[PDB]
C-alpha cells in the first residue's frame, strides 16, 4: 500500500537502498509491521514498524501483489469510523471469554446490511477462532464456530438497532478481529 511502501522507502534512505514491501501486518488499532526487501533481492527481508495517521485504523489486506509479483498480506489505513477491530489486550473489551470491538450504528435508514468480519493470525493471514459473531444492543445475537470469517445479513432498523459490535474467541490462530458493516441485497 502507499503506507507500507512509504515505510520501506524511508527505511532504505540511510543506505541508499531501493526497498519495497514484501508483506505487512496490522498489530493493533493503528499500528502495523512491514517486512521490506531490496528490489534486487527479495530474500533479504528486514522488519520495520509504522502507525496509521490520526483518525485512522490499520486495515489488514490479503493476497495483494507486491513488487516481485507475490500475493501477500498488506496493510493500509482506513477511517476509524468505518472499521471495527480489536486484539486481545487489557483495554480490549472482554465478555464471557470473548474479545469484543467498539459498538456503533450506521447512519442509514431501514436497509439490509451485511456484518463482515474475519480473524487474523499474528502473521497477518486469515486465522481460525473457536467462536466469532456479533452483539446487537449489547447482547450476543449471532455466533459461528470454528471459522476464519463471518458474513451474516441483517435487516437494519434504526428504531430497534442501537448498536452492533463484533467478537471473537482468542487463540493461537486468532490475534485480531476486523469487521465492517456493508449494504447487502
Amino acid at each position: 500500500s502507499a503506507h507500507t511502501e512509504s515505510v520501506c522507502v524511508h527505511a532504505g534512505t540511510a543506505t541508499g537502498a531501493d526497498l519495497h514491501w514484501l508483506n505487512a501486518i496490522c498489530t493493533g488499532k493503528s499500528t502495523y509491521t512491514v517486512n521490506c526487501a531490496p528490489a534486487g533481492n527479495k530474500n533479504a527481508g528486514s522488519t520495520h514498524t509504522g502507525t496509521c495517521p490520526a483518525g485512522q485504523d490499520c486495515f489488514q489486506l490479503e493476497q495483494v501483489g507486491n513488487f516481485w509479483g507475490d500475493r501477500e498480506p498488506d496493510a493500509t489505513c482506513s477511517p476509524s469510523n468505518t472499521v471495527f477491530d480489536a486484539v486481545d489486550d487489557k483495554e480490549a473489551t472482554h465478555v464471557n471469554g470473548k474479545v469484543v470491538t467498539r459498538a456503533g450504528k450506521p447512519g442509514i435508514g431501514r436497509k439490509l446490511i451485511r456484518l463482515k468480519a474475519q480473524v487474523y493470525r499474528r502473521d497477518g493471514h486469515y486465522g481460525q477462532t473457536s467462536r466469532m459473531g456479533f452483539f446487537r444492543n449489547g447482547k450476543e445475537v449471532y455466533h459461528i464456530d470454528n471459522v476464519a470469517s463471518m458474513e451474516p445479513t441483517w435487516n437494519f432498523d434504526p428504531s430497534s438497532d442501537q448498536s452492533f459490535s463484533f467478537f471473537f474467541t482468542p487463540g493461537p490462530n486468532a490475534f485480531r478481529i476486523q469487521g465492517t458493516l456493508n449494504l447487502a441485497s
Binding site: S78, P79, N81, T82, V83, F84, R102, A103, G104, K105, P106, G107, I108, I113, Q162, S163, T180, L181, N182, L183
Partner: peptide, 23 residues
C-alpha cells in the same frame, strides 16, 4: 470489426463500508 480486445469493468462503490456512529 471494431471488436475491442481486453476486459471492461464498470463496478460501483456501493459495497463500501458504512460510516459508524459509536456509542
Amino acid at each position: 470489426e471494431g471488436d475491442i480486445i481486453g476486459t471492461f469493468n464498470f463496478s460501483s462503490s456501493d459495497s463500501q463500508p458504512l460510516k459508524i456512529h459509536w456509542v
